[PDB]
Amino acid sequence: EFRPLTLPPKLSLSDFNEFIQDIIRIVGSENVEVISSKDQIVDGSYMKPTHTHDPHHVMDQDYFLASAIVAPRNVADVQSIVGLANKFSFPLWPISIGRNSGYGGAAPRVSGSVVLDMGKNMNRVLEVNVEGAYCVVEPGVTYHDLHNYLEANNLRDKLWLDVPDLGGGSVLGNAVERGVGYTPYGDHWMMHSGMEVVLANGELLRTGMGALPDPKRPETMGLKPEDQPWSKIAHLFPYGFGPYIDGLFSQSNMGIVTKIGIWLMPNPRGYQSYLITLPKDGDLKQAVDIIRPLRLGMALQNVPTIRHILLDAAVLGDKRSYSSRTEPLSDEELDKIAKQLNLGRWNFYGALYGPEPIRRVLWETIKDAFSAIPGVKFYFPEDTPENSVLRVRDKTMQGIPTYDELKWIDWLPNGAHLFFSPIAKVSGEDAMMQYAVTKKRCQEAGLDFIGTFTVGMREMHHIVCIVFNKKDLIQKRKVQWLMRTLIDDCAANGWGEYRTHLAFMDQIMETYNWNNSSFLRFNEVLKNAVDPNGIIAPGKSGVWPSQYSHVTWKL
Amino acid sequence: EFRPLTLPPKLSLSDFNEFIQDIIRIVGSENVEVISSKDQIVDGSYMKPTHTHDPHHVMDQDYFLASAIVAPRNVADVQSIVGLANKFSFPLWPISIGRNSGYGGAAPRVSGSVVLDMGKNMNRVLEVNVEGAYCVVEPGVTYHDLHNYLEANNLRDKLWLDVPDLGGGSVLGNAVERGVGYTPYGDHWMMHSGMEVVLANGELLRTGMGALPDPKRPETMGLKPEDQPWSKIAHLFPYGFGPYIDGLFSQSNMGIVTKIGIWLMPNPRGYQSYLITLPKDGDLKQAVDIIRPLRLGMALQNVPTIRHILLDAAVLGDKRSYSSRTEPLSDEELDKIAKQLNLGRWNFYGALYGPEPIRRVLWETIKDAFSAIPGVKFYFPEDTPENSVLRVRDKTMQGIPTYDELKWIDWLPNGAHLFFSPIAKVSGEDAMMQYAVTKKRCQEAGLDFIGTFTVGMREMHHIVCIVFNKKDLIQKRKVQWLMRTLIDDCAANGWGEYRTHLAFMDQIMETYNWNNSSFLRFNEVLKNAVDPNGIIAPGKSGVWPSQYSHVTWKL
Amino acid sequence: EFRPLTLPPKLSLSDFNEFIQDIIRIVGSENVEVISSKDQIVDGSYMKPTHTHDPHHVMDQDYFLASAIVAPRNVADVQSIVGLANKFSFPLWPISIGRNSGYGGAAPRVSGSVVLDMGKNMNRVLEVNVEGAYCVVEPGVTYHDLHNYLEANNLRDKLWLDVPDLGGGSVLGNAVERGVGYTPYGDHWMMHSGMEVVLANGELLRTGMGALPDPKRPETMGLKPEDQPWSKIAHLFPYGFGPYIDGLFSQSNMGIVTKIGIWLMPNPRGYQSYLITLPKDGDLKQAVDIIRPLRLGMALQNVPTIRHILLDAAVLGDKRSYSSRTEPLSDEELDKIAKQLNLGRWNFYGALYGPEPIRRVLWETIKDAFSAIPGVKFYFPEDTPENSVLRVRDKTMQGIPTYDELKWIDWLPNGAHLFFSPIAKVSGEDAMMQYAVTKKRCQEAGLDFIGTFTVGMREMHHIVCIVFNKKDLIQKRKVQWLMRTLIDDCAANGWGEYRTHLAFMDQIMETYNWNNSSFLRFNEVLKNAVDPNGIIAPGKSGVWPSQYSHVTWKL
Ligand SMILES: *Cc1cc2c(cc1C)nc1c(=O)[nH]c(=O)nc-1n2C[C@H](O)[C@H](O)[C@H](O)COP(=O)(O)OP(=O)(O)OC[C@H]1O[C@@H](n2cnc3c(N)ncnc32)[C@H](O)[C@@H]1O
Ligand SMILES: *Cc1cc2c(cc1C)nc1c(=O)[nH]c(=O)nc-1n2C[C@H](O)[C@H](O)[C@H](O)COP(=O)(O)OP(=O)(O)OC[C@H]1O[C@@H](n2cnc3c(N)ncnc32)[C@H](O)[C@@H]1O
Ligand SMILES: *Cc1cc2c(cc1C)nc1c(=O)[nH]c(=O)nc-1n2C[C@H](O)[C@H](O)[C@H](O)COP(=O)(O)OP(=O)(O)OC[C@H]1O[C@@H](n2cnc3c(N)ncnc32)[C@H](O)[C@@H]1O
Ligand SMILES: CCCCCCCc1ccc(O)cc1
Ligand SMILES: CCCCCCCc1ccc(O)cc1
Ligand SMILES: [Cl-]
Ligand SMILES: [Cl-]
Ligand SMILES: [Cl-]
Incomplete structure (x- = not known):
């Protein structure tokens, strides 16, 4: 596509085009989508959410909105899109569902960012295990979906899903956000175990026991990493060994999540x-x-x-x-x-x-x-x-x-x-x-x-x-x-x-200022150490990469 | 536009075009204007000044002249034009009126610079306050204009304007220059209070009490900074707290001024x-x-x-x-x-x-x-x-x-x-x-x-x-x-x-050489510290950014 | 001297000693003074002020206090002390009188700093001119002093001094602070013209017309710069040419002031x-x-x-x-x-x-x-x-x-x-x-x-x-x-x-936060550009050099 309605800071239309051109070559036209005009700025419905901006905008409707949207077909594309992003310093803003309304919906903090629709193509319920009482999922799975899969599989009698109110949300999207649910398994973030995510450098990383590799059987040979199986304990014990990094992944720009282990309550029998x-x-x-x-x-x-x-x-x-x-x-x-x-x-x-x-x-x-x-x-x-x-x-x-x-x-x-x-x-x-x-x-x-x-x-x-x-x-x-x-x-x-x-992440992060904003400072250090180019969701939770001046960006 | 009659040092026509192209996309064609031919080099009249060069040229007519002209629509464009300028290292030369004849008129020191017509679009008399006995203004307001606005508003009986001779000049343009006036308020620079200006990095900055923010009322929410109101004391007391920086803004390339507070003499009654x-x-x-x-x-x-x-x-x-x-x-x-x-x-x-x-x-x-x-x-x-x-x-x-x-x-x-x-x-x-x-x-x-x-x-x-x-x-x-x-x-x-x-700023700055040009040296330090790329009016008052060799540039 | 009661951050006693040793060699023992014990912490009287800390301490008495004190004999020593300070990164905190009570007195923001008593030795009323109706002074001159000199010289009938209340203060110390006075010349900072100051690099600098050098007569040959005469217009017109930098010198750590021109009201005859x-x-x-x-x-x-x-x-x-x-x-x-x-x-x-x-x-x-x-x-x-x-x-x-x-x-x-x-x-x-x-x-x-x-x-x-x-x-x-x-x-x-x-410069500077503390940010840039080592009064007005972490220092 040619001309976005708005664009990322510090970037030429000539660059946006080469960048977008290349993405179209990777994910194919069906996947990409440029925001050229007002008729594109439609405020959807919960049932069919808009991926271009905030549906519930307290601010101007066209305030926070994408330069384009892109649905990676699978992990490999994500890695790739990531690398191009680095070449152009183009900002990404990942999302699984776009369901986050009342918190800005699919809109990115910094306008003209490319929005990654992680959900469209990576839609799969990767596993459901009765003995471990957990399942694994991609960004695409909404609660309803999972519920159906349990029900289709007649598993509903064996294991119950915990759910927030409106059942449309992404199971993992809500979990990285640390959203609330109603059953005893109501603490979503608490209930996860083992995750997989793409670093700003595009390298893959499993966490917790996710890291201990499943031994090699003849059947699993040749598989790309993203497709390789997890070890037996991965989804059963969250801690692993050494530092417990998972938290760096909640409510933050440290990386893109691709799959995640989530527990499931055994039917209580009452x-x-x-x-x-x-x-x-x-x-x-x-x-x-x-x-x-x-x-x-x-x-x-x-x-x-x-x-x-x-x-x-x-x-x-x-x-x-x-x-x-x-x-x-x-x-x-x-x-x-x-x-x-x-x-x-x-x-x-x-x-x-x-x-x-x-x-x-x-x-x-x-x-x-x-x-x-x-x-x-x-x-x-x-x-x-x-x-x-x-x-x-x-x-x-x-x-x-x-x-x-x-x-x-x-x-x-x-x-x-x-x-x-x-x-x-x-x-x-x-x-x-x-x-x-x-x-x-x-x-x-x-x-x-x-x-x-x-x-x-x-x-x-x-x-x-x-x-x-x-x-x-x-x-x-x-x-x-x-x-x-x-x-x-x-x-x-x-x-x-x-x-x-989005309109208040900055203000809210400032309330957390004990000892001279020490908490925010420690983060940015991690932030910049991990993503030199600030390619991933800058501004999420108020964390800014060194490239964005706090004067121009804060709000 | 395609080919300027002359161009900025160290820059390809291929670059001028991409640069100008982008500006045209921002301010729209109506605003930009390229200097392609001699028929464009007209020496105007005081009544309708020429923005391309010096009307009163002691030097060759086509000596100092722009590669193009651009009228930002408002502050945001200025910020933007500024950023592009940095990408290309293209020199800017701001002006409000172009009325500065006998001092080189609208001509820039270094030829092929883009001239910012701050005046065209930012023409507004932002405020007139009887009790504070001051008013606020954009680059666009000439003395006559202000006088009319006071008169239209019947305020002329309440407050008098101070004026240099020919009433066409920009009220602020004359003030940053420290021009003389005839009433008791004849010292123009003396009579100002609170200013706003765009740094070379494009960040906004109010000065003096300009810095103490007006508390947030429901009516003022969402406003962009440039549009936000000044605090009550801003225009009443110049000093503020900490260093008094306003002077860095008079007769210098430190930044672009966008608005300014100016006092007004109460009618003396005689x-x-x-x-x-x-x-x-x-x-x-x-x-x-x-x-x-x-x-x-x-x-x-x-x-x-x-x-x-x-x-x-x-x-x-x-x-x-x-x-x-x-x-x-x-x-x-x-x-x-x-x-x-x-x-x-x-x-x-x-x-x-x-x-x-x-x-x-x-x-x-x-x-x-x-x-x-x-x-x-x-x-x-x-x-x-x-x-x-x-x-x-x-x-x-x-x-x-x-x-x-x-x-x-x-x-x-x-x-x-x-x-x-x-x-x-x-x-x-x-x-x-x-x-x-x-x-x-x-x-x-x-x-x-x-x-x-x-x-x-x-x-x-x-x-x-x-x-x-x-x-x-x-x-x-x-x-x-x-x-x-x-x-x-x-x-x-x-x-x-x-x-x-312009033809003598260099010579004049050299007379100020006590202690080995110590004064000039201190400035350039500030200059380069503030505008690494020398994007803003290099050569004004003889101050050169590190990029321009004094051998090639001085004169 | 051997061991100060407290010391500058990041510095060994071994270093303090070599540093102090060298100063003693320059200014001689009579001039230096180390703070070794509690008996030294005396809260003086207005009549005989204490140069070691805050007399009116709202905070702990020994909270803000010097590692030592040093009276330069004249400009040359200042330049020298400055250079050593750079070698050790030792913080200086200049003062003329120490009279600034109710604003922390002679105490430095950062403890263990060496306090420069500019006043002791540079005590001279350098000039009084009837036709120009101004005089020139060193840090040492208190209001009473000047008044006497006018009176001794019978000049009191010709020119009146403006004065704050208590007449003990330093005429220039009060002026750089922008203190208030009672006659028509009550705005002290307003009434100055031409200044001289030592940069962090120890280089001398006159300002305004101070910069245009007095032509060389046979009588003035060989004079060191500090001793050279000012040009005729220096004290008569403040602006000079190019940027008007004087403000960088009020209420700020940009440099040390050594002399200053101040106007004097002609006797009004009523x-x-x-x-x-x-x-x-x-x-x-x-x-x-x-x-x-x-x-x-x-x-x-x-x-x-x-x-x-x-x-x-x-x-x-x-x-x-x-x-x-x-x-x-x-x-x-x-x-x-x-x-x-x-x-x-x-x-x-x-x-x-x-x-x-x-x-x-x-x-x-x-x-x-x-x-x-x-x-x-x-x-x-x-x-x-x-x-x-x-x-x-x-x-x-x-x-x-x-x-x-x-x-x-x-x-x-x-x-x-x-x-x-x-x-x-x-x-x-x-x-x-x-x-x-x-x-x-x-x-x-x-x-x-x-x-x-x-x-x-x-x-x-x-x-x-x-x-x-x-x-x-x-x-x-x-x-x-x-x-x-x-x-x-x-x-x-x-x-x-x-x-x-001192205990609230930090808080007060934060109130000035319009546009994301843009004002403070612009200052620190100037600050660091000018004094790489933060040797001069870091923390004054809340401006911190890059060396002091805002977390550890703010307050
Ligand atoms: C309107 C409403 C909303 C609501 C609710 C009731 C109503 C009437 N009840 C909720 C509840 O009980 N509990 C709860 O947590 N939320 C509730 N909401 C709000 C919202 O509907 C839900 O929170 C919903 O789950 C949020 O939308 P979704 O789950 O689809 O999340 P998203 O649109 O993908 O946005 C996720 C955010 O997290 C980051 N993110 C998302 N995916 C990734 C990946 N793969 N990698 C990295 N970061 C990711 C993004 O920053 C994004 O902003
Ligand atoms: C021909 C003439 C000129 C004249 C005069 C009498 C006659 C017959 N009488 C004057 C007088 O009494 N007092 C005085 O100050 N000037 C007098 N002049 C000269 C001239 O006409 C006026 O000084 C006039 O005010 C100057 O023109 P104007 O006011 O329009 O200024 P300008 O064209 O915009 O040029 C301003 C310069 O300052 C810098 N500048 C201007 N705007 C900005 C902004 N926004 N930001 C940063 N810098 C800015 C530029 O460097 C520019 O060169
Ligand atoms: C107790 C009191 C105080 C007072 C007052 C009435 C009473 C009862 N009335 C005042 C008034 O009418 N106007 C006024 O400005 N102040 C009044 N005060 C407060 C105080 O007494 C005076 O302001 C007094 O002038 C301050 O003390 P002094 O003039 O001696 O200043 P200092 O001790 O040297 O401190 C000066 C500060 O400025 C910086 N400084 C000083 N000298 C230099 C040099 N040479 N170079 C660079 N910076 C310098 C320092 O930061 C220092 O903190
Ligand atoms: C009591 C029934 C709940 C319905 C709506 C819950 C809204 C909600 C839930 C979780 C959040 O983190 C923020 C908002
Ligand atoms: C005495 C009447 C004045 C008319 C012309 C004044 C010309 C003039 C004014 C101010 C300047 O800074 C330079 C030149
Ligand atoms: Cl929900
Ligand atoms: Cl004029
Ligand atoms: Cl006093």
Whole structure:
């Protein structure tokens, strides 16, 4: 192709063309795709995501967007594309799914970068092992896919998949990002073992036990490395020997991941989702406290989550379908809708897994425990309307993917998500302060507060869901203002964020400045040591290669 | 475009083309302009200046001239043009107006440079603030423009503009040059506060308080830096904190200026221009002495100026309209014309600003003071013919722009100005010696001496106006000879020059050689430290980047 | 000497000794002085300042302190000391007086640095010129000194000195710092012309017209450069030709200054100080507004200043002599003391200079103007008690040095000053907000608010005077907390600070971060370009040489 709408910094159109020309020769035209005009800038749908830019853009739509897209056919092309990238110093921005909405979608930090669609061609479920209770996968496999493969293979009775909400995401893409899931295997990054990745220099590298080579049998001779089998222990024990490098690969530009080992929970032989509606707003506090011990003590098995009232309603309906009002709904109105929906001003969904005797016993403790809360009310999925959010999470908390959840994106007219996600202690006091701070700022911006706590063992990921209409330019600015403000406030009160969208990786990395940004400095050292040319995703997580001046690039 | 008439040193036509090609893609054809042929080399008019070379060329017309011209649309293009310039090592030569005639006009020091017309597109009066009594401006705003904007806005009653003579110049272009003006705010460079400029590396930089960022309001979110607002104090206090760098930006190649804060005098509530004709030639001496104390003591408010007789006549008429003679007019003839015109052999114009009581009082002191001079005669504008130079300066000394002054350029046939401008003490003895030295050399060259002293607090800028016919090649050589000689003589008697034309920046910088050119050496260090590639205006003020050999370049 | 109490980073005692040994050989033992023990750490008196560390230490007393001190005998030694410093990479920290208390005194940013006492030996008033109305000076001359020299020479009738409060400071030390003064020549940095300084490489450099060499007469032959005379125009016109570098020398580590030209106001031939007491606290607001126009309009000639009630009382007496109370005095109590002292809750001191007719006229306007304020009352110095602060400023506003002002340092027991100094618009609204913010934080810290506005043309330097007892460790921490907090708040509201103490140069430079700290980055580039080894005052104004890691050094 000829002329991209925008281009990588410090590069001639004459260069873009030779570069793209060569890629087309490698992956063939079917694979490459240049961004020549506005008609190409379409904001897709979750079902068919756009790989050119951010769908949920708080910023200008055409702000972050690719010079082109390229789907490598397999590892070898990746290695090759990598080498050309080095010759031209062209920036790459890898992605498996493009599903990362509310975090910038497929858009690259630095505009005019070539986006690698790792997913298109490397789509394969490489293995599923019952005894090891794990499977291996390429960037292409979405959760639904895996679920089907288990089901096609009748393996679903043998092993369950853990899943985030919307089931479309890339299993590994979500895992390198350290995304949350609902079953006991909810910590995605925790559950991996052995990875494979292309270095900036294009050299291959397996990790952990991935490194101990499978002995040579006559059948495996001649295989290219990428195609060679892993050793028996690779997917069973993560540590290997010597330094444990895997972390360098999460939320960072250190390299491109090509495959990855992920554990799978053996069917527990028991299950029952449940719900507990908390009547009042302030009940959030005692609730969290009651939970703290139940979590550490293992009463609560999976990653339970406290959901705000609006979140369950948003799934049930549009803001319009409840109030003609154009501003944040009052506490009164909030009390009203819960009455209409049979939910609490806060609602704790979670689950029990195991044989009946364990289940019965835990159920008791849990019910007995939450009773101290005046007005609590316990429902089972059966005990509820056939549309209820509980009837949906019941599948989620058992590895069944769904998409009923996107409906909440629809609260306003032109739906667009944007997640603020600070971390918070498993304390009623801390969780109450955080909620109040996030709420007031939301009110200041004219938006309805909406969110859900996801309970980890010693912490909770507070997920503020900023929905906003993607066409009001003013609203967007307010939103930007909103995010920027919240970040600073939570910072000023000990709260961090575990992930964010492109427009704020820079700001967020600065909050991590203990001892003079020592953490960021150590990274860049690693960064430059590993990728001299800054070819791979510069700016991801705020890490910049020496080539990009922090003055011109930061933001 | 294809082939420039001349080109930058060390560069292939193949390179010029790729470079220009890319610029055309950025600013679009309307903006770029290549110098392909002689028909392009037109010497304009003050009213419509030529951006390709020196209009008043003492040197060969086609000596200093551009390879092309380019008008950036806004800051972003400047940053971009800058980056390409670095890739090719192509020299830039920025300009806002092109109005700098008598100092080489729009012509670049090194030929084949691309000239940046900063003025065309960045034409905006960014702000006018009554309480701060200042305004902000882009390179595009000429004095007339500002005056109109104040007038359109009815603000003229609230704040007055200070102005040099011909009102066409760029307000900032004149200010970075440290040009003189007539009201109390006559020191242009003195009156600025906060600037913005593009470094050779293309990074943006505000200065002084310009650096303290305006807090983030929801309305200002997302704005590109160049478009972001300045903090409240930026334009009110020049110093900021730490080193005061602004000076690196005056009369130098350190960077490109994009906007600048300039003060504005609040309407004084009183005004009356005046004149005092000195009868004899030698009266210059006592006059200067009488003034010295009146300046320090604040009797004389604005920048008054002693004008030679010929200067006022030149405005009134052509040398032809007074004498068929082809050589410098005799003292006798000079005495004659003043009699015809009612002026002295020297004439002191100046002004009073304030309420009547202050005005009356100062007027007394001033009149009483100048009386010691036998034959002095005091006129008010009213007291004079309706063409008188005084009726003109009356507007000048009150911020009203005009253009009546160019008429003096017309003394000879093909008018061309060339300013010699040494500095001189506020002393009758020193001012008399300087005048005599400049005069004799003028006579040696066959030219009529013409000039005006502009009185600063502790010094006077002696401005010799070399008019000469731009077509006599011989006259030109004499002129060159004239300048070269004067520079050395005044040097040999402690006199410096505050500014000059391209053909003598080198010579002039050498006069500043105390301690082995230590001053020049310190600059080049800064120069190279800041612009490794010497992309920005090399040779301006004699400062050369390490790339240009002093042997090949000096002159 | 043998072993310093502390030492420069990255240096062996073996090296310190060879280094010091050599210096002793150059300047001779009388000149050098090593800091071996605690008995050396004495906190002096303003009258006899300590050159080893900070007298007013908010931080630990022995925190910032020298490895030794050295008084160069003259320029040549400076050049020499400089060269050795480069051989060892030993850090220097120059000072003329050591008088900079409330800004860290003589203490260096980086501990174990050698402190250059520029003042001891280079003590000379090099020149006083009546016609040019300026004089020249070495680091050694304090204001009192100059005043005496004018007086000894009977020149006091011919020219007045401008002066800050306490008359002990170095005339140039205060000027490079850009300190404030009271007469019309109150802007110290503004009033200079021509400087001389030693580069990090030890090469000499005159600036401005300083560069144009004085022609060679037989009498001046053979003179070393440092001893050579300046050209006639050097001290009369600051700009010179080409870049105006002087600013690189204010508040920065770019070089050591050895001499400097300073203007002197010709005796005005008229004078009368005055006072106007504002009754209420809130009257600050209308007062500022009434002043704004009087400043721009030139009604108010010199730098007038609005003084808080406590400030005038502190000079009159100890907090003890007014209230046994141990906490901030109430608005009621404040109203009381003013009644006792005959002052307003705010008090505007200022002056008139000129012949009677101008004086009378201005006086009218000023009185008439301030009348709108209910209860205002106008006193002349005569009209007041023989101890009144007005009887003191009357000398200050006429160039007479004094020291009556230190008495205010005595409000608490162990007096120690610490200045917070944000800049503020000449607006009642802006000045009121700033005052309120600074006050509340002061109350939070248990300290009495105390301060004075110093009125510039378009701005006011708000000077918060933090007095605190130098022995309460707790109070100190509160103070540190106080400063840190105020800086951030004023930042968050557009307010900057024009100067500060060592412990906060780093924080203050960070407020200046527009566009990603672009301003700081440009400086360090200049810094390293000019002093490769970071030998000169690293850390001054937060500028660090490449050798000092920002992680280890910042603070
Ligand atoms: C709209 C929404 C989003 C959402 C959610 C609910 C709704 C209504 N619930 C989520 C949940 O419960 N848990 C969770 O982790 N995320 C949830 N989201 C957000 C989002 O939909 C998911 O996180 C989703 O998994 C993200 O998209 P996907 O998984 O497809 O990831 P991607 O588009 O490929 O982006 C991945 C990023 O990581 C880096 N990356 C990706 N692949 C590679 C490879 N091969 N090598 C190196 N780096 C890689 C990139 O930096 C990319 O930005
Ligand atoms: C013919 C004449 C000229 C004249 C005058 C009277 C007559 C009859 N009276 C003047 C006066 O009273 N005071 C004065 O300062 N100049 C007077 N002149 C000379 C001239 O007309 C004016 O000085 C005029 O202001 C100069 O032209 P202009 O103001 O348009 O400046 P320019 O053409 O842009 O050239 C500016 C130079 O400075 C540098 N420059 C300019 N812009 C930038 C930016 N943005 N960034 C960096 N550097 C910049 C260039 O080096 C350029 O050469
Ligand atoms: C306690 C106090 C202080 C004070 C004041 C009232 C009171 C009660 N009133 C002041 C005023 O009205 N205006 C003002 O500017 N300052 C006032 N102060 C503070 C202080 O007393 C004065 O500012 C005083 O002038 C500062 O001390 P001094 O003038 O002696 O300066 P120094 O001790 O030499 O420190 C100078 C700093 O600048 C750099 N420096 C100094 N000399 C050089 C040389 N030769 N070369 C390079 N840099 C130099 C150093 O960085 C040093 O820190
Ligand atoms: C409580 C049900 C969850 C639905 C939406 C979860 C949104 C979400 C999940 C994980 C993230 O890292 C960021 C955001
Ligand atoms: C006395 C009236 C002035 C008209 C012409 C002034 C010419 C001039 C002004 C400023 C310069 O820096 C150089 C030249
Ligand atoms: Cl998802
Ligand atoms: Cl002009
Ligand atoms: Cl002082």
